[PDB]
Each structure stands twice: as structure tokens, then as C-alpha cells.
Amino acid sequence: GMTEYKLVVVGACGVGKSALTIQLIQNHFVDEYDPTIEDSYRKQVVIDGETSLLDILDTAGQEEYSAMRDQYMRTGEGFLLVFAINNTKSFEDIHHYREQIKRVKDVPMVLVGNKSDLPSRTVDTKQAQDLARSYGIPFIETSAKTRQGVDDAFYTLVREIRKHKEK
Numbered sequence: 769g770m771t772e773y774k775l776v777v778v779g780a781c782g783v784g785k786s787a788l789t790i791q792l793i794q795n796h797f798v799d800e801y802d803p804t805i806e807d808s809y810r811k812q813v814v815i816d817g818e819t820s821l822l823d824i825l826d827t828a829g830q831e832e833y834s835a836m837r838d839q840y841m842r843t844g845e846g847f848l849l850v851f852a853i854n855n856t857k858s859f860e861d862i863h864h865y866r867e868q869i870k871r872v873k874d875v876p877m878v879l880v881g882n883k884s885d886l887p888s889r890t891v892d893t894k895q896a897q898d899l900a901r902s903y904g905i906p907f908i909e910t911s912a913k914t915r916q917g918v919d920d921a922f923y924t925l926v927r928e929i930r931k932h933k934e935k
């Protein structure tokens with residue numbers, strides 16, 4: 769059989785939410801994707817031998833309340849919290865994104881450090897590890913450019929959802 773998963777990708781503008789999503793959906797790096805496009809995208813994959821259909825909301829709007837988005841997130845099963853390792857402000861926003869999610873919703877999440885290909889690092893892996901530990905969630909390093917960690921990020925989130933469902 770198969771299992772469907774309703775996922776949401778959040779994080780500051782320009783961290784690579786769309787690039788990550790498109791790597792999952794289409795398996796290549798789309799470097800120019802309209803920063804204002806918010807949509808859900810579906811992709812069939814296989815995770816630990818089970819056919820898995822992922823529906824992924826790639827967030828992009830700036831408003832505090834956006835009806836369709838909020839109804840999606842209210843019923844979202846897991847969230848990727850994405851920052852960029854070269855942008856300290858994106859990492860500082862993570863705890864605010866976590867707060868907003870809890871507000872709309874124990875919720876499966878994965879902390880994602882994207883742009884790991886860039887040498888101009890400003891956020892240390894160890895800081896990201898501290899934060900993920902404080903929430904009791906996984907931390908995964910990614911590059912949407914090279915595709916490093918992309919499956920790890922989404923598949924780890926699915927694995928976190930499986931665990932949550934057992935409870």
C-alpha cells in the first residue's frame with residue numbers, strides 16, 4: 769500500500785524553501801523561483817520501502833493570517849523549519865516560526881540548515897544542534913544546490929510523523 773503525508777516548509781525569505789521543495793518534487797536545483805509563489809506540491813517517493821505520497825506546502829506570503837495557508841497548517845502533519853547557514857537573521861527567526869506553528873496547532877518538526885554548500889557560514893552547526901535539542905527535534909544539514917541532505921530532511925520528517933502516529 770501507500771501512505772500520504774501533509775507537510776509544510778517554513779522559514780525566512782530567501783532561505784531556500786522553494787529550492788528544497790523543488791529538489792524533492794523535480795530532482796534539480798531551480799535557482800530562480802518567484803519568491804511570492806505559495807503553493808502545495810505533490811510527489812510520490814519511496815521511504816524505507818513504502819510508497820509515500822508527500823503533499824508539501826511551500827510558504828511565501830507575508831501576512832499573519834492567510835485563510836487557506838492557515839487551514840493547511842492547522843492540519844499539517846509535519847513542518848520543516850528552514851534557515852540558511854550564511855544568514856544569522858534566518859536562524860534567529862526559527863524560534864518565532866516554531867511559536868507560530870504551535871499557535872496554529874506535540875507536532876513533528878525538523879530543523880533544516882540549508883545552503884550548506886556555501887563557504888560563507890555565519891551560523892555554526894553546534895548552535896543549530898543546541899536549538900534542535902531544546903525542542904527535541906532532529907537537525908538536518910542541506911544544500912538545495914547540490915541536493916545534499918534533501919531526502920534526509922523530508923524523509924526524517926516522515927519518520928518523525930510515523931513515530932508521532934504510534935503514540
Ligand SMILES: *CCC(=O)N1CCN(c2nc(=O)n(-c3c(C)ccnc3C(C)C)c3nc(-c4c(O)cccc4F)c(F)cc23)[C@@H](C)C1
Pocket residue numbers: 778779780781782785803804827828829830831832833841861864865866868869872
Ligand atoms: C520571500 C518571501 C518568503 O519566503 N516569506 C516566507 C514567509 N513569511 C513570513 N513572514 C513573517 O513575518 N511571518 C510571521 C508573521 C506573519 C507573524 C509573526 N511571526 C512571523 C515569523 C517571524 C515567524 C510568517 N509567519 C508564518 C506563519 C504564520 O503566520 C502562522 C503559522 C505558521 C507560520 F509559519 C508564515 F508561514 C510565513 C511568515 C515572509 C518572510 C515571506
Ligand SMILES: Nc1nc2c(ncn2[C@@H]2O[C@H](COP(=O)(O)OP(=O)(O)O)[C@@H](O)[C@H]2O)c(=O)[nH]1
Pocket residue numbers: 779780781782783784785786787788798799800801802803882883884885886910911912913914
Ligand atoms: N548556494 C545555494 N543557494 C541556494 C540554496 N537554496 C536556495 N538557494 C538560492 O537562494 C535564493 C532563495 O531561494 P528560494 O528557494 O527562492 O528561497 P525561499 O524564499 O525560501 O523560497 C535563490 O537565489 C536560490 O537560488 C542552497 O542550498 N545553496
Ligand SMILES: [Mg+2]
Pocket residue numbers: 785786787801802803804805826827828
Ligand atoms: Mg519560495
